[PDB]
Amino acid sequence: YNAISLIIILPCISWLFPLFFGRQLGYVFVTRMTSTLIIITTLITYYYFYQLLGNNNPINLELFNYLNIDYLDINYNFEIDALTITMLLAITTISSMVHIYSIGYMETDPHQVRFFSLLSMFTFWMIILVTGSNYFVLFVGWEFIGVTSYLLISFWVTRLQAM
Amino acid sequence: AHVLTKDMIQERIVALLESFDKVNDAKNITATANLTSDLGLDSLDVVEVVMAIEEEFGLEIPDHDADEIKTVQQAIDYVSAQPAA
Amino acid sequence: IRASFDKAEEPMLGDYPDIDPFPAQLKNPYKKYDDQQDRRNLEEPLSVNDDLYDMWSPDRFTHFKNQDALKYFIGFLTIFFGASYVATYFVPEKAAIPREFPYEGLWKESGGTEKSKAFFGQRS
Amino acid sequence: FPPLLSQEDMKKHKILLAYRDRCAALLVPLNECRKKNYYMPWACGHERHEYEMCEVADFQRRVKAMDKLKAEKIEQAKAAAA
Amino acid sequence: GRYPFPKDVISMTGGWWANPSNWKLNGLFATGIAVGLALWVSTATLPYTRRREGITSESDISKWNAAAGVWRERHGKISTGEA
Amino acid sequence: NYKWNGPLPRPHVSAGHRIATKFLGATMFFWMFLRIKEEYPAMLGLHNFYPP
Amino acid sequence: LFHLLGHAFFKALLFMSAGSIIHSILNESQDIRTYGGLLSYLPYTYICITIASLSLMAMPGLTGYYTKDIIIESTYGSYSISNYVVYWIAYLSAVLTCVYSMKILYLTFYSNPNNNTITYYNAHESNIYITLPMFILAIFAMFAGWILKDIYLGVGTDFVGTHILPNNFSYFDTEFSITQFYKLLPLISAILVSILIVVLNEFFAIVFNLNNKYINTVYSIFNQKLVSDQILNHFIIFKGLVTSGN
Amino acid sequence: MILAGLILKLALYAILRLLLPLLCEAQILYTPMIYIISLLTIILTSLATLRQIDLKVIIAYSSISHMGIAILGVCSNTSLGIYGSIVLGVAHGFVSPALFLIVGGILYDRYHIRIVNYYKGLTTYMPQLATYIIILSFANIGTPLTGNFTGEFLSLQGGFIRNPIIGGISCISVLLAAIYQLKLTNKLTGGISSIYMHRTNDVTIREKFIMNILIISTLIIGICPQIMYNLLYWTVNNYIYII
Amino acid sequence: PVPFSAANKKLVTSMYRQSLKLARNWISNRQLFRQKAVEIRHKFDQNAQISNPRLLARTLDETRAHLYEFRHPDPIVPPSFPGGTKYERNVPPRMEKIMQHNLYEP
Amino acid sequence: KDPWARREAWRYQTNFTRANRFKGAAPGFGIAVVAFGAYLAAEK
Ligand SMILES: CCCCCCCCCCCCCCCCCC(=O)OC[C@H](COP(=O)(O)OCCN)OC(=O)CCCCCCCCCCCCCCCCC
């Protein structure tokens, strides 16, 4: 059980699996799946914020090397600072409540598999944007949330003004 | 949801025209009644009732389609043509 | 024809109809077209510099003349910065001294050296 | 008023840059009290009342110093003209 | 609404109103894959995590500052605010 | 829809909705009366800290 | 950071109350001019959106008070002279923060109805999936500031590890240097202007519905985004497309 | 495909292999002329992309703009710029023939006309083609974890070393490369399906095979550019002349 | 420009539909609106008895310019209609069999 | 004076009359004043 990793990995599961298995699982399943997985992400980060008031001792996780070149290294590094946990509890709360909300608000809409998928990747690249521990991972999340905002504002590709 | 019928449009437009003051009578109203001749409406009172009918059905009318609905039956068929209610 | 760059394109065209450029948005929407989304009939001649007069073109507002709207925008801009800059003069003074610091302004605490006391130092 | 803490004691208790003055001696139990609970606002109120009262005393001597500054400006303004 | 759609087209995210008949049966597989992947990646990244503060002992950091001072003395390098 | 151009009926809200309006309504005005009362000298601005 | 925290809970309840009343109208219209009175028909979405609007105007006892009014306090409390000016600017926004919120509480719940009768027959409450997040975020947007204020607004706090320079830090200065007038003033006027916009919307309704030619040009400036989109589109987008066509 | 994936990178190779070893003392005197021409071919070709009626021609001018980014890392006199030009050249050689497949294979074999004005709303009859068109669009711009951004980023950084003011206006290429590409992508992806185009077959297995390979091979370089540093760490140090 | 006729009728009916719709989105209240609309009606009732073409065309384009001064930024549109926000959300795809282009593979 | 005077009456009648339009404006005010009076008297 690793608190710093399940904040990252669980909205990645909640995004990759609605796309790769949406035809196979169906909307009625992928609604409740993406919902409950963001719910347990949100509960894990409340419990971590409760831990972090005990000791102000952040946890980071380290990954492989992005690039080594002469005076410059970039690693994938993920660190929940107090600023990071402040933003993180807010965005996971608003995310999970909007997932539960859009279960019932979108039940007449056709394509809510792709919709709940894109909501979850929006949450996921927001997660990586907040918890990154250099200026590079901040950039990766910073670009891909704009990419999601393309894919989210233009959800009705039929409508001209949305595009 | 909520889906209209033909008789719903009928009893909406009849009650609409019963609310209106410058009609001749509340008793001569039919499905096939001319607004201009049978109801005693001006060139400009038929326009006020086309404004009220388009507000009442929640739908918008261009100027080319507003003049054509001279009788009430043409208005009922025309309002039933659109998907919006 | 109507725009200036459309007139700049005129001596280049040869055996091309040179039709009036009209916005595809400011066509009325209730006339029946072949494509309702394009607002365009099946064989209708496409203008000199079409893609500025497309449905995918700019939004092309119609409620203000553009020179007038330029004036109104720069007017609100200038009135805000002028009002704030003049209101910097009608300001009251404050009632406290800006607060001081021990250990000669914490100069050892914020890095610092005895020769570098002025660059990394506080009020004392 | 509390005594000024030592420079080494500031280094030990890791008090921030802007909190270190002749009142920060009342800060280090407070935060420690704040770490015993989980920063909950109903709890640990006596010590933050202590620290606030110490800071009110600092504020009063700040305002008296600013008052002392305002008299000498008027006095030099009258003395420079005459 | 429930307007009619063509069934010839196949999209990976499902199509218009994708609801297969065995969606509980496939939901069992998807919960298995999701729980197994989450537990496996959470246990795999366990030794790569570390605490932020208190990893190395303070005597090492004071010695590193001392060696920095030695290397800075050898090259005769002034401070920033010395001018 | 039984009437047109005439007086509407009083609506029918279900019992679970109209009790939850009263719970969210009661906890608003109760919590505001708590926080006005417990922070009354600070919130309004009283006992100023300038020396006399 | 504290305002960024509480603001999220606020606005999410605002957008979801708005979507609940757009979803409940059979028209699914968005014009507030065509909503009309819906107070007796939708009491739940009303009590949600009014908790959100009262938090939004920093009415005290809600977390908008604690997030929002202390920034207006800190504009006056700062050391530099020029900050006094933005006090009034931030102050002006707070009064502005009332008035449109009163509009989006008035014309959709209190006013005489504007829509046709059938949507008032078919107006009903939304599902349980729409109701429960609004409930939970109403509770959060009430209690979050009183719970987390010790964390983000202490007399001295060591939670956020950022390092203010010792002179840019004016937080002890700002709490004490406020006169009674400057602190009492945004509270009382954000109350009074809210009740003012309500009571002037019912009883008179001519002050806002004048037909001066000059106020209509001014209103149409402020309607079309302080003509910004036009000043973006014709002079940057369209000129850019012409010079790219050159 | 062989032209825009390999011939342009062959001349990017020839500026390294032939010029930077024995024209060094020349090369320093002339880096501002190269920066004139490089910035002036990034700005003015990517701006001419906006007014295009044809569809393969847009991806052509896109290739011009990316090679214009590429060569100011070569002449940057930096370790970063040389490595960024190589990773740009290899990643553009992946991503760009996939775009020429999307305009030429899936879209000219079916309709035989390349004018942009015919093509609208390709999503509702071909969902997975529209999926490709968007994720190959975003891989072209400089949206990260794709290897195109690693090339663009290290090239712009190396070009900022050698002259900062040329890097300041060189950096707006991230904007200018997004404008025309997403302006094409939303016109192809969205709208009611076109009245001109009758519905045709979905993307076949061979085309999806080519696409999957050319997209994985961008993503591997995007997630970890260190996978080919084992070849270049000699040749990043080789061409540098900092006395 | 012309007395009592069907084309002049079409013009004046179009202008009256305009002036009602135009007044509709300025005014939020029902009561002030229906007062104002009765007034507008009284302005059209005071006219429409004009004999000459000269003063008729004079008042005609004068009230056309008076109609142009009171234009509104966003007209109230119903959402399912081309000014609206529900316009073209899911336009249903037309039923088409697949055209084929290759002899060998789909 | 008003030609649509009998249509536009139901807007001002039973549900949207002025005394009814302000009914659920403060739903839990009457409960919370009693609970706050009880908490006022019970704290001592
Ligand atoms: C401290 C300093 C503070 C400075 C603050 C002042 C900053 C002002 C600068 C603002 C620049 C904004 C960025 C410009 C590029 C934005 C592109 C864009 O957004 O295009 C939008 C356009 C669609 O918009 P539209 O059709 O009008 O409305 C749709 C809603 N239905 O989409 C399209 O139509 C696509 C085709 C047009 C794309 C634009 C082509 C020309 C691009 C020119 C870029 C110029 C960049 C340099 C600007 C210099 C400004 C001085």
Ligand SMILES: CCCCCCCCCCCC(=O)OC[C@H](COP(=O)(O)OCC[N+](C)(C)C)OC(=O)CCCCCCCCCCC
């Ligand atoms: C997408 C959701 C995120 C999933 C994250 C799962 C994490 C699993 C545990 C990580 C272990 C680890 O990577 O270890 C790192 C290992 C060995 O490096 P090390 O020195 O031993 O450790 C580093 C820690 N330091 C710094 C403290 C010492 O190198 C690698 O593997 C790199 C292999 C890269 C292959 C090319 C990428 C292929 C991607 C293709 C995609 C289509």
